[PDB]
Amino acid sequence: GSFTSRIRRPMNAFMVWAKDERKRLAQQNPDLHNAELSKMLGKSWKALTLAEKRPFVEEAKRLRVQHMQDHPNYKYRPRR
DNA sequence: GGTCTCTATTGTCCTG
DNA sequence: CCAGGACAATAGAGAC
């Protein structure tokens, strides 16, 4: 296999939902910077019922479980 | 001038 | 299980 391939942390439920919404807001607000778009997303994400977040939670689960198969003894190591 | 850091958000995990 | 982090996706924007 490979040791020089970057491995990126699987995205939690917020980031899975934000990937598609951030695009969707970036269309409707095309001058806006992603720093400003994030402030919009966090506010929208607070406002979602736990019922409304559960589909993105389930998709985040699938990811992490798949992240395991591909990198099976993976340990998260933040740099410093 | 490519290449890296940073913004800004949440949730997840880490190392002190 | 606090305190102080890194870091997932995203393009703009500064720095060197």
Give residue limits of the domains in chain A: 1-80
Give strand letter and number of the nucleotide nearest A79 (CA to C1'). Answer: C6
Q: Which residues in range 5-44 of chain A are in contact with strand B, contact meaning CB within 7 A of any of its atoms?
A: 9, 12-15, 18, 33-35, 37-39, 41-42
- Phi and psi angles of residue A36, each rounded to the nearest 5 degrees, phi first: -70, -30
d(CA A64, CA A49): 23
**Solved by what technique?**
X-ray
Q: Smallest Cα–C1' distance to nucleotide B9: which residue has it?
A: A38
d(CA A14, CA A69): 22
Given a contact cutoff of 8 angstroms between Cβ atoms, the answer to whether A6 and A74 are in contact is no
Distance of alpha carbon A68 from the chain centroid? 16
Q: What resolution (Å)?
A: 3.0
d(CA A11, CA A21): 14
3-class SS letters over chain A: CCCCCCCCCCCCHHHHHHHHHHHHHHHHCCCCCHHHHHHHHHHHHHCCCHHHHHHHHHHHHHHHHHHHHHCCCCCCCCCC
Given a contact cutoff of 8 angstroms between Cβ atoms, the answer to whether A60 and A10 are in contact is yes
